[PDB]
Design an enzyme around this catalytic site. Structure first.
Site, PDB file in Angstrom:
ATOM      1  N   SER A 112      -6.090   3.224   3.606  1.00  0.00           N
ATOM      2  CA  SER A 112      -5.571   2.256   2.641  1.00  0.00           C
ATOM      3  C   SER A 112      -6.695   1.487   1.950  1.00  0.00           C
ATOM      4  O   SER A 112      -6.550   0.299   1.662  1.00  0.00           O
ATOM      5  CB  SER A 112      -4.619   1.264   3.304  1.00  0.00           C
ATOM      6  OG  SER A 112      -3.659   0.774   2.373  1.00  0.00           O
ATOM      7  N   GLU A 127      -5.069  -3.624  -7.087  1.00  0.00           N
ATOM      8  CA  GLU A 127      -5.432  -4.229  -5.811  1.00  0.00           C
ATOM      9  C   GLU A 127      -6.466  -5.326  -6.037  1.00  0.00           C
ATOM     10  O   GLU A 127      -7.378  -5.161  -6.845  1.00  0.00           O
ATOM     11  CB  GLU A 127      -5.976  -3.177  -4.840  1.00  0.00           C
ATOM     12  CG  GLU A 127      -4.959  -2.134  -4.397  1.00  0.00           C
ATOM     13  CD  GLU A 127      -3.983  -2.659  -3.359  1.00  0.00           C
ATOM     14  OE1 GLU A 127      -4.105  -3.834  -2.953  1.00  0.00           O
ATOM     15  OE2 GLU A 127      -3.090  -1.889  -2.945  1.00  0.00           O
ATOM     16  N   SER A 163       0.799  -1.224   0.000  1.00  0.00           N
ATOM     17  CA  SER A 163       0.000   0.000   0.000  1.00  0.00           C
ATOM     18  C   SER A 163       0.836   1.280   0.000  1.00  0.00           C
ATOM     19  O   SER A 163       0.293   2.373  -0.143  1.00  0.00           O
ATOM     20  CB  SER A 163      -0.949   0.013   1.200  1.00  0.00           C
ATOM     21  OG  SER A 163      -2.022  -0.893   1.005  1.00  0.00           O
ATOM     22  N   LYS A 203       3.137   6.143   5.585  1.00  0.00           N
ATOM     23  CA  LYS A 203       2.292   5.237   4.827  1.00  0.00           C
ATOM     24  C   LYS A 203       2.834   3.823   4.975  1.00  0.00           C
ATOM     25  O   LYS A 203       3.930   3.520   4.504  1.00  0.00           O
ATOM     26  CB  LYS A 203       2.238   5.633   3.353  1.00  0.00           C
ATOM     27  CG  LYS A 203       1.340   4.739   2.515  1.00  0.00           C
ATOM     28  CD  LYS A 203      -0.121   4.943   2.871  1.00  0.00           C
ATOM     29  CE  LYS A 203      -0.957   3.741   2.479  1.00  0.00           C
ATOM     30  NZ  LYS A 203      -0.659   2.574   3.354  1.00  0.00           N
ATOM     31  N   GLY A 251       2.381  -0.599   4.868  1.00  0.00           N
ATOM     32  CA  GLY A 251       1.903  -1.602   3.939  1.00  0.00           C
ATOM     33  C   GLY A 251       2.069  -3.014   4.461  1.00  0.00           C
ATOM     34  O   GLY A 251       2.957  -3.293   5.267  1.00  0.00           O
ATOM     35  N   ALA A 252       1.198  -3.904   4.001  1.00  0.00           N
ATOM     36  CA  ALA A 252       1.284  -5.318   4.334  1.00  0.00           C
ATOM     37  C   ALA A 252       0.899  -6.152   3.120  1.00  0.00           C
ATOM     38  O   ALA A 252      -0.013  -5.792   2.374  1.00  0.00           O
ATOM     39  CB  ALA A 252       0.392  -5.648   5.518  1.00  0.00           C
ATOM     40  N   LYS A 297       0.495   3.861  -2.772  1.00  0.00           N
ATOM     41  CA  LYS A 297      -0.660   4.754  -2.807  1.00  0.00           C
ATOM     42  C   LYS A 297      -0.284   6.218  -2.580  1.00  0.00           C
ATOM     43  O   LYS A 297      -1.063   7.119  -2.893  1.00  0.00           O
ATOM     44  CB  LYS A 297      -1.699   4.303  -1.777  1.00  0.00           C
ATOM     45  CG  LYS A 297      -2.396   3.007  -2.165  1.00  0.00           C
ATOM     46  CD  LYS A 297      -3.054   2.317  -0.983  1.00  0.00           C
ATOM     47  CE  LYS A 297      -3.655   0.984  -1.411  1.00  0.00           C
ATOM     48  NZ  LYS A 297      -4.169   0.186  -0.265  1.00  0.00           N
TER      49      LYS A 297
END
Length: 263
Positions: free
Chosen positions: A105, A141, A45, A209, A211-212, A48
């Site tokens: 997200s 996504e 993410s 920001k 993310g995973a 983004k």
């Protein structure tokens, strides 16, 4: 600080996976620390931010307006759409979509924004034309989160990501109003709780920001600094670990601790 490097090495040994890390002075541009800065890691993410960066570039050129309302269908709603699923009737503005993408997200919000700019290939073309010939987005996504080993799709290097983020936030590309907007969206991040913000002392500024992804993919990009003003950029990625989300969060958290401790 070397004490931050050993924490990254600590994180590497305990997670059983690569940990990409880089520290970068926001003003001068001098790299303070770097661990595997030329290796590729899944963006998740964190892309983004780059996404809305291209969106704001279009806004500056007049090709886009932040107040433009975008309506969408139920078939557009992909996994984890905490904001966009609530606005099927009224739709959402470009501004609201970026807010949902960076703060919450929202996966569907990201795809809608990708459609506006012409897809992942056009986001890659955007980064390419601002001097980032390393970072690449290939999928939408949630497919971009697959993180197949040695797959270079939807990846970046710590170095490319850090310098790209700096050029978006403080570089000559975006207008003053757009740089402020992007870092405002990042400052209002809601889903980066157990990471850098967990080691962030009171009064400190942070705009990040996280993310995973699949296969132990975890990461975060951030501009932060003491006295309520950002002075450094921090980029940290990892992938491959079979560890739980909890430890992956705490490992990156421990990395943030020594970063602050040895500021």
């Amino acid at each position: 600080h070397p004490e931050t490097l050993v924490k990254v090495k600590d994180a590497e040994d305990q997670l059983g996976a690569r940990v990409g890390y880089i520290e970068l002075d926001l003003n001068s541009g001098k790299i303070l620390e770097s661990f595997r800065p030329e290796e590729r890691f899944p963006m998740m993410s964190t892309f983004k931010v780059l996404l809305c960066g291209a969106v704001l570039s279009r806004v500056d050129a007049g090709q886009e307006q932040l107040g433009r309302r975008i309506h969408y269908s139920q078939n557009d709603l992909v996994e984890y759409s905490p904001v966009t699923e609530k606005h099927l009737t009224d739709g959402m503005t470009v501004r609201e979509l970026c807010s949902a993408a960076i703060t919450m997200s929202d996966n569907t919000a990201a795809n809608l924004l990708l459609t506006t700019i012409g897809g992942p290939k056009e986001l890659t073309a955007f980064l390419h034309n601002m001097g980032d010939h390393v970072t690449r987005l290939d999928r939408w996504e949630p497919e971009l989160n697959e993180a197949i080993p040695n797959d270079e799709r939807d990846t970046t290097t710590p170095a490319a990501m850090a310098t790209t983020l700096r050029k978006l936030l403080t570089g000559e590309l975006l207008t003053l109003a757009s740089r402020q907007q992007l870092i405002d969206w990042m400052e209002a991040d809601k889903v980066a709780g157990p990471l850098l913000r967990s080691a962030l002392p009171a009064g400190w500024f942070i705009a990040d920001k996280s993310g995973a992804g699949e296969r132990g993919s975890r990461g975060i990009i951030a501009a932060l600094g003491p006295d309520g003003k950002p002075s450094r950029i921090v980029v940290a990625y990892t992938t491959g670990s079979q560890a739980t989300m909890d430890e992956r969060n705490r490992q990156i958290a421990e990395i943030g601790a020594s970063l602050i401790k040895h500021w």
